[PDB]
Amino acid sequence: GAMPNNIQIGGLFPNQQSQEHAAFRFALSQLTEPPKLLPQIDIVNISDSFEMTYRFCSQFSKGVYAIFGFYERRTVNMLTSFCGALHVCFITPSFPVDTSNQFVLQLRPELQEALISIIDHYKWQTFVYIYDADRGLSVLQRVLDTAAEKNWQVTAVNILTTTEEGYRMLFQDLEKKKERLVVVDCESERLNAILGQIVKLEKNGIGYHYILANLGFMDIDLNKFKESGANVTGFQLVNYTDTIPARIMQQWRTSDSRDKRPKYTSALTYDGVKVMAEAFQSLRRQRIDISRRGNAGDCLANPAVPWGQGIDIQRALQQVRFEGLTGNVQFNEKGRRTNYTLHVIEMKHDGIRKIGYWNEDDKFVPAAL
Amino acid sequence: AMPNNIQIGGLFPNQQSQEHAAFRFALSQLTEPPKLLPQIDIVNISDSFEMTYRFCSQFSKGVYAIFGFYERRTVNMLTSFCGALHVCFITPSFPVDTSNQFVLQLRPELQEALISIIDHYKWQTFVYIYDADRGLSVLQRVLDTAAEKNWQVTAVNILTTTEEGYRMLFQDLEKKKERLVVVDCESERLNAILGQIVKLEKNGIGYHYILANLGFMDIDLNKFKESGANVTGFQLVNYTDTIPARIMQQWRTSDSRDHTRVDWKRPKYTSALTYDGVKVMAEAFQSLRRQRIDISRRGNAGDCLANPAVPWGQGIDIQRALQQVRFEGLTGNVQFNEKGRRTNYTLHVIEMKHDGIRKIGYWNEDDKFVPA
Ligand SMILES: *[C@@H]1O[C@H](CO)[C@@H](O[C@@H]2O[C@H](CO)[C@@H](O[C@@H]3O[C@H](CO[C@H]4O[C@H](CO)[C@@H](O)[C@H](O[C@H]5O[C@H](CO)[C@@H](O)[C@H](O)[C@@H]5O[C@H]5O[C@H](CO)[C@@H](O)[C@H](O)[C@@H]5O)[C@@H]4O)[C@@H](O)[C@H](O[C@H]4O[C@H](CO)[C@@H](O)[C@H](O)[C@@H]4O)[C@@H]3O)[C@H](O)[C@H]2NC(C)=O)[C@H](O)[C@H]1NC(C)=O
Ligand SMILES: *[C@@H]1O[C@H](CO)[C@@H](O[C@@H]2O[C@H](CO)[C@@H](O[C@@H]3O[C@H](CO)[C@@H](O)[C@H](O)[C@@H]3O)[C@H](O)[C@H]2NC(C)=O)[C@H](O)[C@H]1NC(C)=O
Ligand SMILES: *[C@@H]1O[C@H](CO)[C@@H](O[C@@H]2O[C@H](CO)[C@@H](O)[C@H](O)[C@H]2NC(C)=O)[C@H](O)[C@H]1NC(C)=O
Ligand SMILES: *[C@@H]1O[C@H](CO)[C@@H](O[C@@H]2O[C@H](CO)[C@@H](O)[C@H](O)[C@H]2NC(C)=O)[C@H](O)[C@H]1NC(C)=O
Ligand SMILES: *[C@@H]1O[C@H](CO)[C@@H](O[C@@H]2O[C@H](CO)[C@@H](O)[C@H](O)[C@H]2NC(C)=O)[C@H](O)[C@H]1NC(C)=O
Ligand SMILES: *[C@@H]1O[C@H](CO)[C@@H](O[C@@H]2O[C@H](CO)[C@@H](O)[C@H](O)[C@H]2NC(C)=O)[C@H](O)[C@H]1NC(C)=O
Ligand SMILES: *[C@@H]1O[C@H](CO)[C@@H](O)[C@H](O)[C@H]1NC(C)=O
Numbered sequence: 001g002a003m004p005n006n007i008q009i010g011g012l013f014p015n016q017q018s019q020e021h022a023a024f025r026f027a028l029s030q031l032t033e034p035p036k037l038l039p040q041i042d043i044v045n046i047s048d049s050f051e052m053t054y055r056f057c058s059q060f061s062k063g064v065y066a067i068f069g070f071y072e073r074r075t076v077n078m079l080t081s082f083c084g085a086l087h088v089c090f091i092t093p094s095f096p097v098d099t100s101n102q103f104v105l106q107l108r109p110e111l112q113e114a115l116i117s118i119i120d121h122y123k124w125q126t127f128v129y130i131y132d133a134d135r136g137l138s139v140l141q142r143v144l145d146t147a148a149e150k151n152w153q154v155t156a157v158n159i160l161t162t163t164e165e166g167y168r169m170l171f172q173d174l175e176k177k178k179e180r181l182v183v184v185d186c187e188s189e190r191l192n193a194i195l196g197q198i199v200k201l202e203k204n205g206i207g208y209h210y211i212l213a214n215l216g217f218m219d220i221d222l223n224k225f226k227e228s229g230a231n232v233t234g235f236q237l238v239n240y241t242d243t244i245p246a247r248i249m250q251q252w253r254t255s256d257s258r259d260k261r262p263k264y265t266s267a268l269t270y271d272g273v274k275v276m277a278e279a280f281q282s283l284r285r286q287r288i289d290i291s292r293r294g295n296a297g298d299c300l301a302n303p304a305v306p307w308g309q310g311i312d313i314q315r316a317l318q319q320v321r322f323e324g325l326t327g328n329v330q331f332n333e334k335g336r337r338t339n340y341t342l343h344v345i346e347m348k349h350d351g352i353r354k355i356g357y358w359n360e361d362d363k364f365v366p367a368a369l
Numbered sequence: 370a371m372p373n374n375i376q377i378g379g380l381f382p383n384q385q386s387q388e389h390a391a392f393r394f395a396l397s398q399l400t401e402p403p404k405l406l407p408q409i410d411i412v413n414i415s416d417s418f419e420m421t422y423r424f425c426s427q428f429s430k431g432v433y434a435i436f437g438f439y440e441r442r443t444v445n446m447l448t449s450f451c452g453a454l455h456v457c458f459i460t461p462s463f464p465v466d467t468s469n470q471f472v473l474q475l476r477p478e479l480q481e482a483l484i485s486i487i488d489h490y491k492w493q494t495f496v497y498i499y500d501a502d503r504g505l506s507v508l509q510r511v512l513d514t515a516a517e518k519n520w521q522v523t524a525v526n527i528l529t530t531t532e533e534g535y536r537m538l539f540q541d542l543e544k545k546k547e548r549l550v551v552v553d554c555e556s557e558r559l560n561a562i563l564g565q566i567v568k569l570e571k572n573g574i575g576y577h578y579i580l581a582n583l584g585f586m587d588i589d590l591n592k593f594k595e596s597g598a599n600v601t602g603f604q605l606v607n608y609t610d611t612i613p614a615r616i617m618q619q620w621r622t623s624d625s626r627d628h629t630r631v632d633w634k635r636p637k638y639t640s641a642l643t644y645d646g647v648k649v650m651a652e653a654f655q656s657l658r659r660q661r662i663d664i665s666r667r668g669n670a671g672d673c674l675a676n677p678a679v680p681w682g683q684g685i686d687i688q689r690a691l692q693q694v695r696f697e698g699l700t701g702n703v704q705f706n707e708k709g710r711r712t713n714y715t716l717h718v719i720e721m722k723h724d725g726i727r728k729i730g731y732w733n734e735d736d737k738f739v740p741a
Contacts, residue, residue, distance in 0.1 A: 048449055048453070049417070049445055049446045049448075049449035049450070050449045050450055050452075050453040050454075050674075050678055051453075051676065051678075053421060053446075053674065054674040054675065054676050054678075055676075057674060058674075073445075074445040074448075074449065074467075075445065077417050077442045077443065077445055077446065078417040078421075078445065078446050078449075080417075081416050081417035081418045081442070082417065082418050084418075085416075085418040085419075086418075133509065137505055137509075141501070141505075141526060144523075144524040144525075145525075145526065145529055147523070148523050148524065148525055148534075148538050149534070149537075151538075151541070153521065155515070155516055156512040156513070156515070156516060157513065157516050158509055158512070158513060161513050162513070162516075165517075166513075166516060166517055169516070169517055169519075170516065172519060173519060300418075300421065300422045300425060300426075301422065302419065302422050302423075304418055304419075304422075
């Protein structure tokens with residue numbers, strides 16, 4: 001049969017004032033085709049499993065059809081388990097983890113392979129790897145595995161445990177090598193501070209090279225770092241001057257002016273809304289009969305009784321394919337971004353320039369220049 | 370005052386195990402009121418949803434504490450539910466460093482000791498073999514010390530490594546003839562992993578294996594002792610020390626004429642921790658009762674989830690009583706810091722050479738490691 005004209009969508013957000021939140025509202029306002037996505041977002045501590053659970057169960061008993069929100073490390077397991085038990089989908093731009101089930105739709109592309117490619121490309125054989133551990137440890141594992149495989153000499157520093165002396169200690173046996181190579185793997189909000197810290201710790205007469213293992217390159221203090229002559233390479237998800245993103249920034253620009261550069265997490269929040277819209281428009285027109293109980297269907301039971309039409313909504317969300325702010329948006333059957341392109345940017349000589357791009361199939365292709 | 374019966378919830382992975390039998394045995398030994406009344410539910414301890422259903426269900430029916438096991442996927446959920454509602458979870462599961470006062474880890478930390486031992490042996494470069502399934506706490510710790518002491522660690526997840534992949538890092542090593550390996554794996558796989566690992570050594574070279582985990586004593590000592598393998602590990606229970614010996618005695622002599630029993634040869638360390646775990650609860654509750662600090666709670670559904678979470682009022686009293694417990698158990702001196710970790714305990718280091726199984730020395734928080 002049919003679906004209602006409104007589709008209630010749950011939200012798990014860390015706060016109601018943020019640029020991701022603005023991206024969310026503005027993208028919802030761009031939708032014209034039915035059914036209408038009716039957001040019902042809650043402000044929640046995304047690090048606390050208890051609070052997230054209360055919200056998720058609260059959202060579920062209420063009959064929302066999917067949940068868009070963010071998840072932290074401590075809560076990733078709880079969210080994956082609850083989605084899998086209830087067949088309720090979670091759409092998120094948060095750092096992708098390993099071993100989600102198929103009901104978690106990850107807007108954010110995995111970086112680990114791209115990172116490996118860029119390291120091989122530069123022919124790095126030994127390097128320092130810096131990690132904070134609050135956004136997953138998969139990348140480090142992937143780095144250590146390839147290192148063992150390729151006989152690379154990797155030194156690992158989790159910044160949180162290292163006050164100032166640790167960084168200085170790495171060069172105790174580092175003369176006769178005129179170029180030190182460093183991978184920085186940390187949360188985006190924190191990238192600028194760590195970069196600033198480790199550049200201060202630099203020694204004279206050694207050449208320093210940095211590769212950013214996380215998106216977040218362009219959302220940093222670029223002028224300070226380029227003007228300092230820093231060598232830095234990172235990934236960029238959004239071409240802000242390509243045809244479709246330029247158009248989008250256009251309307252967004254006009255929208256703000258009556259009532260500046262979006263971060264990659266904002267851009268994914270905006271595509272995440274289109275993912276939901278595409279899925280629910282697609283069920284509506286496909287004539288797939290969906291109903292959901294306003295009833296307080298209790299979230300907790302043994303065994304968990306899955307929403308029976310949930311698998312239908314999971315399939316629609318997974319098969320979506322379109323051109324968004326972050327280029328081609330598409331998922332494999334496990335709910336990860338697939339068939340995406342990453343722009344590789346190299347900041348060098350007081351200049352930042354695109355040096356190529358990376359995708360799963362072609363890996364990395366150098367630009368003409 | 371105090372109820373004559375104190376309902377304790379349990380979260381157990383299995384119907385039948387040595388740990389469950391140790392749990393039961395230890396309960397039967399208690400004679401002082403109040404009665405500890407177990408209400409355990411068999412549950413998938415990897416699934417956060419099942420665990421949440423059981424935690425909430427037990428909290429609603431009025432348990433005073435929960436004794437149970439958790440896995441890498443559920444440690445965050447339990448810590449969070451314990452912290453928000455102020456019910457204590459007492460557990461021998463692999464301990465963590467982001468817990469809270471409401472989670473009593475009967476199991477002692479090993480990560481600092483492991484490093485110490487790696488020092489007394491003076492290893493500067495080595496392979497670290499680890500188990501992704503169970504956590505990366507120890508690996509991170511070692512990697513950081515590698516950093517600050519120029520150790521050159523090659524880390525290898527057993528669950529991505531092939532037979533050839535493993536020998537690869539080696540067939541290409543040739544300066545010192547010794548290849549030093551740290552094995553950090555789930556205690557159940559330890560026997561196998563050591564088995565798969567031993568054949569995979571190119572024949573003509575020497576070795577040294579250090580185990581990052583407890584489980585050493587429960588392995589096939591015979592193949593390695595016979596082999597002349599060099600294995601070093603930890604021991605937490607001395608079965609020949611006075612209090613443990615007597616505890617074994619009582620346990621063997623009851624299961625002697627009991628006509629339907631099994632589960633007694635030499636106890637796994639998890640069973641020992643489970644036995645001490647119960648004594649922790651007993652000591653805390655008998656102590657609460659003899660102090661006239663009252664308690665009680667209503668059976669009530671819908672109770673569990675709220676925003677904000679409404680913690681149990683007397684929860685903190687029970688947590689404090691459980692945390693200040695102290696005594697000689699199967700696993701030595703049982704005592705907790707305010708973070709809920711085992712404290713003031715000693716680890717014994719054991720060495721396998723020729724036909725020698727020997728204590729090399731011991732470890733603690735202030736002396737680090739002292740040779741014997
Ligand atoms: C770190 O971890 C360690 C363990 O590794 C902890 O050390 C333990 O701490 C506990 C708790 O404090 C200790 O138990 C208490 O011990 C005191 C001290 O005296 C004891 O030990 C010696 C032997 O080593 C004996 O002298 C004592 O035994 C005599 O008295 C008892 C009655 O108290 C009686 O049963 C015996 O017959 C015995 O008499 C003989 O000796 C006396 C004196 O020399 C002599 O006059 C007589 O003629 C006989 O020869 C005694 O056991 C003890 O007083 C405490 O008893 C009091 O409190 C307890 C409550 O627990 C009650 O049971 C009791 O009625 C008393 O009120 C405790 O037994 C434990 O010994 C100790 N273990 C070790 C190995 O040293 C550390 O505390 C931890 N460190 C930190 C910082 O936390
Ligand atoms: C959201 O919920 C999380 C998880 O439940 C809360 O985390 C807890 O918060 C406090 C303060 O941030 C942490 O304490 C700090 O721990 C360090 C490290 O041991 C300690 O040295 C500091 O003194 C400090 O007390 C606590 O460990 C942490 N619990 C965790 C991470 O499991 C958090 O409070 C909530 N966040 C917000 C913004 O309300
Ligand atoms: C950025 O990269 C350049 C080029 O690799 C680094 O320049 C090298 O620096 C060392 C030590 O000062 C010289 O001896 C090399 O011969 C330089 N090579 C070239 C080609 O210029 C430079 O130091 C790096 N920038 C920073 C800030 O570390
Ligand atoms: C990966 O994404 C690309 C880029 O969007 C897809 O290319 C499109 O292919 C469809 C159907 O074959 C055409 O209608 C479009 O004209 C193509 N668009 C662009 C921009 O090239 C490609 O099909 C996808 N590949 C896979 C394997 O799914
Ligand atoms: C207990 O729950 C866990 C996690 O919720 C289940 O784990 C899944 O197991 C399948 C089958 O091996 C794996 O392919 C998935 O990767 C696992 N999911 C996750 C999130 O890890 C597990 O199967 C359950 N165990 C039992 C005995 O039922
Ligand atoms: C256990 O350790 C000993 C010494 O720590 C290893 O002995 C080495 O053996 C190789 C040949 O296998 C010799 O070339 C070395 O010179 C020996 N080293 C020393 C310091 O004596 C022994 O091989 C190890 N056991 C096993 C089973 O590998
Ligand atoms: C932006 O798109 C333009 C097309 O005008 C192209 O030249 C460039 O490769 C893109 N920018 C990045 C950073 O990839």
